[PDB]
Nucleic acid binder design. Structure first.
Ligand SMILES: [Cl-]
Ligand SMILES: [Cl-]
Ligand SMILES: [Cl-]
Ligand SMILES: [Cl-]
Lengths: 461, 216
DNA sequence: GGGTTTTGGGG
């Protein structure tokens, strides 16, 4: 039988191991300190310890610290989200610089178990899978974890409390992070709370997050795909431990360490909700980069129709090398993908628009002028991406608008470009932007007779 | 202004066709570097990033016989000074070499170095792999983008547009998506290798060998 | 424990 004690009531005197349930509000990533030692540090709260004394009006969070020690990386919890619950067995308590510090040697006899406050854990949300039950821990140390029938009430009550807490308070209070526009003034590392405006796949191992916080400042930071697979555009995250990059001249960059962590918030979070609505992307960095000869920051030149905003993306490697051998890929005709354009054909922009004879299924130059049929775009992009970064290939993506697909891509209605100088000029400008280094296209494509045709996508520059 | 001497140096090399002679002259002064590691990987820093220097058999023979009481693999935490050095691009397997990116590596060729032992270097930020830096990786991508565009515009010529009849009235048509694959260069192999830069060839000494010479 | 490995693109 395990007796669980509340955080403020745990004994500082008894030599002895204590057990508890708590809500995790912050955590380092599990990290190595030496040739046989790993540590994970967490900030925890519960109904008895969650807020500091205020003779005033701006609620600052109070918490205890939990330090988990282990001899293996796998024996430590990877916290991806603030608000989830941890159960610890056999922890010792002591005062470390005035604060309650619970310590647990997972390598000896201590153990931990993580429970999701929301219906699904971060990992379950990512892979779209329901949980075994509301009493099943999604992660735990050792080969086994037991949940006694008497514990159920503790978990359920704490979950209810966690939601009330996160929906009523910021939890991650202003004293727990630094405004991005003041990052340069920090002496060492600091924390950040910001909205992810964009997740740019820099290469097969790395994501580049474009972040913006309440101060209106934008910063970019690298985020390993394996380490933080839960990063999503439009979501608010707390970054534990970042440093201002003094060596980045072209763009504002934050440097992360092996112990740094990127965590999201449970659904009920008042802070995340407020920040999601309040923070918006105005594309200032992109607009300024377009005036430069070489842009060290990526520019996503297009946006897909809202009806495809939730559609998952497929790499070029999958689109062109597996779409005829993968059960899941063969099941679809519409896809969303991202890529950069290496070359646009035909070279002559004036020939991008041709006359189309529906009866003969043949297109022709409009240089002879006077109705060769309905005007259409017949453009071909040779593209490449992160998934095909090193190979000797370029991939064909089409903008053939004879049946409506991609008609308004350029925000220029099809016209005789030999005669309409205004349309020709807009298209020439677009061509230069499309083939410029670091310009990317985010497009929805439809597979037709072995080819991919752009649809429901428009340039935003 | 770039505060990292290694970043500014390596960036200029990539931004100038990997031609060291085209790199600014006012950056070719002796380098005073702190040794972060000496084995299995000899890594030096400039206070911001760490790079792996490549020693010529001559640089080592000079060091050994100018400082016989000093073991190179025992230089961890020690500050060294590189008097004679050069830079050159090399094609490598980035899956094996961590001091590289996208199968490209800018190598610091050391020709002469002396140890300023017992000299305490000013504390700084924790040094990171230059080849893992956001801007630097991006600089390398620009370099490959340029080489990629030059090759594709050279290889693909004339009309190569998919015949519009193939995508029209395709209700009863089926195709293999690999029809959309276009080779960027006439080169052999799945990997892009059609670069125009003059790849370096300076033979250097492997660190695991300088270990036997000094410690059996 | 608000920290620094090498698994040297989770650690
Ligand atoms: Cl203790
Ligand atoms: Cl998870
Ligand atoms: Cl098909
Ligand atoms: Cl690249």
């Amino acid at each position: 039988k395990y007796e669980y004690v509340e955080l403020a009531k745990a004994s500082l005197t008894s030599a002895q191991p204590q057990h508890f349930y708590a809500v995790v509000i912050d955590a380092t990533f599990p990290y190595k300190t030496n040739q046989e030692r790993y540590i994970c540090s967490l900030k925890i709260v519960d109904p008895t310890l969650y807020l500091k004394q205020q003779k005033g009006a701006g609620d600052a969070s109070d918490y205890a610290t939990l330090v988990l020690y282990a001899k293996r990386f796998e024996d430590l919890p990877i916290i991806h989200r603030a608000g989830d619950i941890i159960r610890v067995h056999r922890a010792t308590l002591r005062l470390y610089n005035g604060q309650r510090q619970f310590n647990a040697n997972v390598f000896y006899s201590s153990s931990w178990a993580l429970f999701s406050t929301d219906k699904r854990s971060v990992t379950q949300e990512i892979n779209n899978q329901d949980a075994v039950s509301d009493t099943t821990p999604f992660s735990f140390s050792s080969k086994h974890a037991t949940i006694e029938k008497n514990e159920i009430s503790i978990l359920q009550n704490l979950r209810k409390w966690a939601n009330q807490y996160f929906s009523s308070y910021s939890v991650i209070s202003s004293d727990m992070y630094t405004a991005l526009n003041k990052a340069q003034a920090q002496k060492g590392d600091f924390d950040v709370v910001a909205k992810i405006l964009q997740v740019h796949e820099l290469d097969e191992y790395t994501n580049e997050l474009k972040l913006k916080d309440a101060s209106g400042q934008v910063f970019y930071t690298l985020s390993l795909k394996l380490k933080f697979p839960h990063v999503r555009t439009g979501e608010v995250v707390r970054i534990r431990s970042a440093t201002y990059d003094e060596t980045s001249t072209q763009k504002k960059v934050l440097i992360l360490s092996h112990y740094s962590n990127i965590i999201t918030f449970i659904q009920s979070s008042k802070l995340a909700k407020e920040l999601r609505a309040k923070i918006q992307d105005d594309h200032s960095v992109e607009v300024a980069s377009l005036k430069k000869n070489v842009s060290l920051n990526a520019v996503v030149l297009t946006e897909v129709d809202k009806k495809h905003a939730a559609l998952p993306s497929t790499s070029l490697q999958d689109l062109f090398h597996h779409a005829d051998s993968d059960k899941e890929l063969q099941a679809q005709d519409t896809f969303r993908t991202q890529f950069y354009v290496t070359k646009i054909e035909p070279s002559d922009v004036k020939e991008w628009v041709k006359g189309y004879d529906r009866k003969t299924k043949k297109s022709s130059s409009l240089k002879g002028a006077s109705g060769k049929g309905d005007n259409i775009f017949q453009v071909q992009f040779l593209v490449k991406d992160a998934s095909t970064q090193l190979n000797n290939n370029t991939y064909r993506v089409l903008l053939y608008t004879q049946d409506g697909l991609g008609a308004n891509f350029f925000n220029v209605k099809a016209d005789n470009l030999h005669k309409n100088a205004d349309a020709r000029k807009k298209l020439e400008d677009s061509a230069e932007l499309l083939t410029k280094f670091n310009s990317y296209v985010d497009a929805v494509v439809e597979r037709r007779n072995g080819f991919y045709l752009i649809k429901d996508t428009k340039l935003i520059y | 202004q770039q505060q990292s001497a290694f970043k500014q140096l390596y960036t200029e090399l990539f931004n100038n066709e990997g031609d060291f002679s085209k790199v600014s002259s006012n950056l070719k002064k002796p380098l005073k570097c702190y040794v972060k590691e000496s084995y299995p990987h000899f890594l030096v820093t400039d206070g911001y990033f760490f790079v792996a220097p490549y020693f010529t058999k001559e640089a080592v023979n000079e060091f050994h016989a100018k400082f016989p009481n000093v073991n190179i693999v025992d230089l961890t935490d020690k500050v060294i000074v590189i008097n004679n050095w050069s830079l050159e691009l090399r094609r490598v397997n980035s899956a094996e070499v961590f001091t590289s990116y996208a199968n490209l590596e800018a190598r610091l060729i050391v020709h002469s170095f002396k140890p300023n032992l017992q000299e305490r270097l000013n504390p700084t930020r924790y040094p990171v792999n230059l080849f893992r830096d956001d801007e630097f990786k991006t600089t390398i991508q620009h370099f490959r983008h340029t080489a990629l565009q030059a090759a594709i515009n050279k290889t693909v010529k004339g009309d190569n547009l998919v015949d519009i009849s193939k995508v029209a009235d395709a209700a009863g048509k089926k195709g293999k998506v690999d029809a959309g694959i276009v080779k960027a260069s006439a080169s052999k192999g799945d990997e892009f290798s059609d670069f125009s830069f003059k790849e370096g060839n300076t033979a250097t000494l492997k660190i695991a060998d300088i270990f036997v010479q000094e410690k059996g």
